[PDB]
Amino acid sequence: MQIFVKTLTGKTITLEVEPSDTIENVKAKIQDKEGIPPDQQRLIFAGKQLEDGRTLSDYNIQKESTLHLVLRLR
């Protein structure tokens, strides 16, 4: 299942993923494309902060789902 990631600047990215993919993996996808590291980028879905210890299916995320990326400070 794929998911769209809109950044704070409006940059939309489509990354193919799987229902058992870990949030830490999706974050790496934006890293290889947007060059943003995991310790600073944050993914939020429905006002909920995704945890690096869970899977997309655990957050009820489905294909064509869109997530929000928030930049940290470090």
Partner: protein, 32 residues
């Protein structure tokens, strides 16, 4: 009156949760 950096879009900002909204506004204010 809200001021957004040259790299922040308002459409995606209001779509973020308030708790995170405040943290991002507090950062633009401490330096703003």
């Amino acid at each position: 009156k809200i001021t957004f950096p040259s790299d922040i879009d308002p459409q995606v900002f209001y779509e973020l949760p308030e708790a995170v909204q405040k943290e991002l506004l507090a950062e633009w204010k401490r330096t703003g």
